[PDB]
Structure formats: structure tokens, C-alpha cells
Amino acid sequence: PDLADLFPGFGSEWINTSSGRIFARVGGDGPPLLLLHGFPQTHVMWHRVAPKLAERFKVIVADLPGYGWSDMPESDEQHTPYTKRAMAKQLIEAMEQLGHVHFALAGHDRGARVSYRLALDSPGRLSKLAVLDILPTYEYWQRMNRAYALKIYHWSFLAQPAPLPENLLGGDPDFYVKAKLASWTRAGDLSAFDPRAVEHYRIAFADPMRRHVMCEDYRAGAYADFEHDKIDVEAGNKIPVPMLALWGASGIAQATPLDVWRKWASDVQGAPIESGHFLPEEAPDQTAEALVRFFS
Amino acid sequence: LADLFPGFGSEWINTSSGRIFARVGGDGPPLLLLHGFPQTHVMWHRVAPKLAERFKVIVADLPGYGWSDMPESDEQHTPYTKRAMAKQLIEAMEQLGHVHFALAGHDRGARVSYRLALDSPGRLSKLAVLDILPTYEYWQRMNRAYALKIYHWSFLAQPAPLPENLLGGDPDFYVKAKLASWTRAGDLSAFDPRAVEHYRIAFADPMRRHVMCEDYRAGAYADFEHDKIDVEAGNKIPVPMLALWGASGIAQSAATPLDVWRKWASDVQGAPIESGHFLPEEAPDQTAEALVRFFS
């Protein structure tokens, strides 16, 4: 009706946590694998590659806390419930509700930031980890110069104190969500996306409280998340989980991503994928292929 | 609109690139006063009568701002480059018979002023800049802290129509937020309400707002390139210069202004004034005195 079912055969589950419920589409069977979405999308971003992974895994496609259909915990002045640290702990809680204490994880964009923070804080919870088209938060801010500030302007814009970004995004929320989706594709338009998927992103972005939380996300990314990343880099903490790093040839991560990730993880492999930023939709077959071989 | 320059004449000056509006008053040596973002010529209403004591004061709207004509921009935003702005105002000065004049600039017009002195030093007797550093110096010092501080440099520079769409939802809010955020008090209490209505009305026009985005686009590309050639070639400004910066201004953040300006000019004097970014309005008496003593 209002929104289409893009996960045929997948169940729909509401997982209870201390900080609120998390929505997830669960399907398949086998070892548990968690797939997290990013900005400005929802879990439906995984609809093209989830069926392939469901052949070998129990795939759980969850809304990040405050995103999609997940509950939105009340934020505070340090934006703690939307830090990557607190997000990871909520997701660990949700997984325990499912009986999964040791699972595999793949993240994209904001949820990818949740993924590597989770691996930094709780390595024992992960068998293997994959991040798609990101570099660590500390690494983004440290390389901030003229060229990169123009490219990822929204990192500083979205981090402005409330209610300035909330008011401006309300000027034309339809346009902004579509401008962000097309600008990061290799094609430079919406042709790569499925029309039913864009309608999910459109509806979610249309709610003023949803946009507030995504602002809280980027505010955490400019302050608290930077400090936590800053502690680890100074301490020499590296990720012990076997890791795969996939980036788009015209993505945002393009520093040399693999050389950068070697400083943050003991055991990491990497491959470029011919796409823009949205790998699972731009290059679904190639993304699914790299994930299954790594996770198997 | 209120008359904030009592007794001043009003002249419409014709140039190749369009007409320039200016309020003319006093008598004596000619002195040009330029405004900046997001204001108009009326920003000078507190100090213009004092300088009109001793100079022929010309208070002009920048090209595309206020009541001046708005030439059509192009792919490089050429008519809103500081280089092209400088030639237009030189053209307007010649209309009045002023081929050798004194100039003081604030914010964007200060950028026009130091560009004017680099390209055409012989046209200036003395030059004053208020609460700025060269454009190149802003971008070179861009880091995490500064990118959060002056986010609008990267936001306003995004390709059209992305900022124009966001500003159009509630332009009243944005113009007031920018004026209040840059004062030391952090509100609109420093400004005269009749002057604020001038800024609001000017910002209320969609074509005006496009021109200010074109200004920041030139400041993000062409004007930086112009600054880059001069800084690397060792070209310095030979005109005697005065640099006034606010203790809570933008220039004082992330640099010490006087040492920076010594790198760009042979003969510079500088003084800090206890104010925010809007010197002629926040601290009118202290600013006017410093201007009169320097220009005399």
C-alpha cells in the first residue's frame, strides 16, 4: 500500500531493548549475520543483496536506533544515545534477545561506523566484520581541508546546534533526500535505485523527528564519536576481528582506504567495487559476491 | 525601508555590469565604504556621519546586493568574483571622478578591497579591512574545529540549487540566525531594528539569495585561486593598510590576525576592538575613531 515489501519470504520482527524497540527483517537460516544501513536510508537498502546472503546465513536487516521503523530514544546534550558507542550496545542487546552472542556483521555508512566501533569495544561478539565505503570518523576529521570540506559539507552542516539544520531541511525535505541519493551515485541521478526503495527513504525523511535524530547522529559524529576514536588511535588499539573493507571507485572514501584501515586493524583485506557510494544498490551482484566469499 | 543616513544623497551609478547604488555624504577626500554578508550599505549608518565630518563618504551596495543590479552569473561565477567586483566598483568611482580614493571594507567587501589593492594598487591612497583574513588563509587553515565554526563557507558553496532550496523555506530565520550568531552578545540586541528590516527585506528575495550563494561559490573556487597565485608568487599589497578585528570576531579564531596580514602587505597596522564580527554596529564609536585617525 503506502510502502512495498522488498524482502519476499523475510519475516518482520520488533526486538525489545532497554533503549527502545528495533525493527528488523529476518530471513534464511544458518550462521547469524547482521546488516546495518546508513544515511539517508533505511534497512530496505539491503533488499537487492539480502536474498543472496540468505542462501548461506540467517540475515537480520535492522533499522538503526532512531531510523526507519526503530524507536527513537530521547537524546541529551552530549547526544549520547546517538553516539556510535551507545548504538553498538543497543544492537548487542537486540541480538541477545535473538540468542545471538557471536555473529557476523556488515555495515554501510553510519551503520558501518556502528560496526567498527562495536568491534573496537566488544571484539568477542564478532566472528567477522565488513565495512562498506567508509573510513574511521577520526580519519575523516583529521584529513579535513578545503577539498574534503566541500565534498562532505554535511558533516559540519548537520552538526550545527539545533534547530538550525532542522529548520533548513524542513524548507524542502523531499529535494534534500533525493539530492543526497543522486549526488553520491556514479550516474548522478536516481536511475540506480529501485523506485519502491526511494519511496521508503522519502517517507522516513518526511518526518521532522526522524530528521532531528539524524542531526543528532552527525552531532555525535563531530564530537563524542571523534573523542572515542581519538582515544583508541593514541592507545594503539586495533581491530582483532578479520575484516573486509569495500569501497566504491567513485565513492566518498576515495586517502587510500586499505592503507588507512591497516592502521586500525590487525587483519584486513580490501577490494574496490565499480560504483558510487551506495554499493549494495549500484553494484548488487558484485557486492553480494565479495561478502559471501569473505563470510564463508 | 527607513532612511538611516539623514541628509545623504542617493545616486544610481551606471557601470558595464549594471548599476551600483550608493549613499553619498560629506565633503573632502573620497572614502568608499563597502558592506558584506548578509547585510547592505545601511550597516555603516552608525559611523558614516562621523567620517562624513572629514571625508566625502560613499556608502555603496556591493554588486548584486541591496539595491544594486544583479548581473547574470556563469559557470565560474565570474561577475561575483572579488576580482570582477573590484573592477565594477573602480568603474563606479570613475563615474564620480574618483580615480584615487580611500577604501574600507567589512566581510565580503573587505575581500573586494584587498583584491582591489592587489590588482590595482594605484587606485587606492589607503586601505582598511575589518574582521577578515585573506580567503586563501581561511581555506588553508580549514580543520575540524574551523569547519564547524564557519560551516556556511562550505554549505553556501554547494552547487545550485541545493542551498537556494533550503534557504527558501524560511529565509527570515536564516538571516536572523547569521546576524545573532556572530555578535559577542549572541543575539540581535546590538542592531538597530530599522537596519534589521533592511537586511531581512534584501534576504527575502530569491534572486538576491542566489547572488549570495554565487558569492560564496566564487569564494570557494575562483577567488581562492586568485589568492593562491599571489601568496605563492610573493605578491604583497603596497598600499598602507589598517586591519581591525573583533575579540570575538571570525578572524581572531584559528589565527592571530596581525601576523597573518604582515605576510600579505608591506605596511600594515592593526588593533583589536572589543566586539563581535559586526564592528560598525557593535562598537560604532570605537570603530569610527580608529578609521578617522588612520585615514587622516
From Swiss-Prot, chain A:
Gene3D superfamilies the record matches: alpha/beta hydrolase
Active site: 109, 277
Outcome after substituting residue 39 to A: Reduced catalytic rate. Minor effect on substrate affinity
Catalytic activity: a haloacetate + H2O = a halide anion + glycolate + H(+); fluoroacetate + H2O = fluoride + glycolate + H(+); chloroacetate + H2O = glycolate + chloride + H(+)
Residues marked Important for enzyme activity (site): 133
Enzyme class: hydrolase
Pfam families with a match to the protein in the record: Abhydrolase_1
GO MF, one example: haloacetate dehalogenase activity
InterPro entries: AB_hydrolase_1 (IPR000073), AB_hydrolase_fold (IPR029058), Epox_hydrolase-like (IPR000639)
Enzyme Commission identifier(s): 3.8.1.3
Outcome reported for the amino acid change (mutating residue 109 to N): Loss of enzyme activity
Keywords, in A-Z order: Hydrolase
Top-level taxon in the UniProt lineage: Bacteria
Domain AB hydrolase-1 as annotated: residue spans: 31-267
Binding-site residues for fluoroacetate, renumbered to this chain: 110, 113, 154-155, 218
Function: Catalyzes the hydrolytic defluorination of fluoroacetate to produce glycolate. Has lower activity towards chloroacetate and bromoacetate.
Family named by the database record: Belongs to the AB hydrolase superfamily. Epoxide hydrolase family.
Complex and partners: Homodimer.
PANTHER family, alphabetized: EPOXIDE HYDROLASE
Annotated protein name in UniProt: Fluoroacetate dehalogenase
Species this chain originates from: Rhodopseudomonas palustris (strain ATCC BAA-98 / CGA009)
Lineage: Bacteria, Pseudomonadati, Pseudomonadota, Alphaproteobacteria, Hyphomicrobiales
